[PDB]
Amino acid sequence: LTLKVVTVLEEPFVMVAENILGQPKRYKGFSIDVLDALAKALGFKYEIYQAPDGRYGHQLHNTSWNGMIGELISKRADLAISAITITPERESVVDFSKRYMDYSVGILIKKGTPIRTFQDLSKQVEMSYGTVRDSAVYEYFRAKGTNPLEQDSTFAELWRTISKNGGADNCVSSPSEGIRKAKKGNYAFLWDVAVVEYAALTDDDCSVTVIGNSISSKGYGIALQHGSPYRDLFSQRILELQDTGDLDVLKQKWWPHMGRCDLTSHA
Amino acid sequence: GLTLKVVTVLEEPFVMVAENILGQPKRYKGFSIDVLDALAKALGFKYEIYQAPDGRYGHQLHNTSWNGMIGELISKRADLAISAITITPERESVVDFSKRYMDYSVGILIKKGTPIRTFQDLSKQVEMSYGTVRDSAVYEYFRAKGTNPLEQDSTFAELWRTISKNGGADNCVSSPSEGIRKAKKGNYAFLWDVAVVEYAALTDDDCSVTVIGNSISSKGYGIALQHGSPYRDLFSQRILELQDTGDLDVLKQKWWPHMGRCDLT
Ligand SMILES: *[C@@H]1O[C@H](CO)[C@@H](O)[C@H](O)[C@H]1NC(C)=O
Ligand SMILES: [Ca+2]
Ligand SMILES: [Ca+2]
Ligand SMILES: [Ca+2]
Ligand SMILES: [Cl-]
Ligand SMILES: [Cl-]
């Protein structure tokens, strides 16, 4: 039994591993290790391919999705794994396992500013900060920033800067560009805290740090086909790997704080 | 119309008794009740609630049977179980949980005015009684953590030495309501759901207690259904929708009102 796995490159969840010339691509990372653990415990083989458009996928027309979600809908893949958050729109068309890691949004910024919280960022006048335009993060801040029911003004202030002039002034086209702009200075990039944490830990110049928050609204999941017979099985083993600590060990492996950049060097 | 049988246990502010006149059935209220109400409205079912006869969440016994609400689902006396139930692998093996509708972690309830401000501070205590509910999933959590040689710091082992003293008899309590009462009295720190002890501190008549959190979240609260229940996936989808729209945040603010209540700082 061999399962067809679709993925998208994103450090440190899924990364290209060294392969000999003339031999097929290999992959490594936190999500690969989770997948391997499931394959060993459940006893299956798998083969990986990258989404032809490199996209997680969104809806274009009724039933028309691109990206990895589209690959599952058309049943070209049995499952998708990368850094995919569990959302209701995606769960209505495919079937997610229970989460194997929590997701939240963080801030990547150069070390040495007085900014230490999301509230501090929101108080900034004239400072450029933002996220990937037309992303889920963008839409999250839209919803929180236009809702009169928020207890703290923090979200309205952040959205005013992020969305300025339609999101064209302060947002970027990709996480790699956002990471690159934050390292150069005079910009703070809002994105997956796990993604920017790894970028900060491996920064050639150890020049950046990450601000997180207590607000975790979603989990990372494995996406399977609609009606897949394996979804509940994956959920059960994922709960077991969490409870034994195997997941925490893998997280420590791929987000190692010793031997890498000190994110708290300005304290 | 279609009516589901719901089993629960009382834990403030998740499920609480709301009104009980003689000649009328018990009514319930709380965060978990409002989550259940939204699912009932959206999926078109009614429901009737009863309390687990042994008042337990449920765990496995030596003959592989289960007590508590879990046992009520296995026997098919209940169609679903809801209160403040954590999704664990042992339970999911015998019942089917929705995806979580809230995150869970362990906190400490303690009187204000002590130098104890973290779990590490608590673990350093020499003379002090602190613990959790005996024979609970929280007791088993500190057992697993306290006996793990792979733990980086001695904190969990030290906590376990105090919690487990004399097989747990000395420093643990029989119920959360006993743990809360003893922390409010003083000279006892109670370890339990951060959300349960936060409500106790927010609503303290004297505003005399506080909560130490900082514990990372490993688990979620879920609704438990029978094995193979056709409603598990429908519930998960609607829960994800209630989160996405902000409705679950509104309900959390309703039942954990920070403004107008005790300052915990
Ligand atoms: C299993 O053990 C419990 C606790 O002693 C007991 O109440 C129950 O009747 C037992 N069930 C059997 C024999 O299946
Ligand atoms: Ca689905
Ligand atoms: Ca199950
Ligand atoms: Ca099923
Ligand atoms: Cl989940
Ligand atoms: Cl699920």
Shape of chain A: globular
| Biggest sheet character of chain A | 5 strands, mixed
| Total domains of chain A | 2
Per the CATH scheme, the topology name of the largest domain in chain A is D-Maltodextrin-Binding Protein, domain 2
Greatest chain-chain contact:
A-B, 27 and 26 residues
CATH superfamily of the largest domain in chain A, please?
Periplasmic binding protein-like II
Strand order of the largest sheet of chain A: 4-1-7-15-8
Shape-level CATH architecture of the largest domain in chain A: 3-Layer(aba) Sandwich
Estimated helix fraction of chain A: 25-40%
DSSP helical segment count of chain A: 10
Outline the fold blueprint.
Two copies of one chain form a homodimer.
Chain A: E1 2-7, E2 15-17, E3 26-28, H1 30-42, E4 45-50, E5 59-61, E6 64-65, H2 67-73, E7 79-80, H3 88-91, E8 95-96, E9 101-103, E10 105-110, H4 118-122, E11 129-130, H5 136-145, H6 154-162, H7 175-184, E12 188-192, H8 193-201, E13 208-211, E14 218-220, E15 223-224, H9 231-244, H10 246-254
Parallel strand pairs in A: 1-4, 1-7, 11-12
Antiparallel strand pairs in A: 2-3, 5-6, 7-15, 8-15, 9-14, 10-12, 10-13
Helix pairs in contact in A: 1-9, 5-6
The complex binds 2-acetamido-2-deoxy-beta-D-glucopyranose, calcium ion (3 copies) and chloride ion (CL) (2 copies).
Residues 61, 63, 65 of chain B line the site of 2-acetamido-2-deoxy-beta-D-glucopyranose.
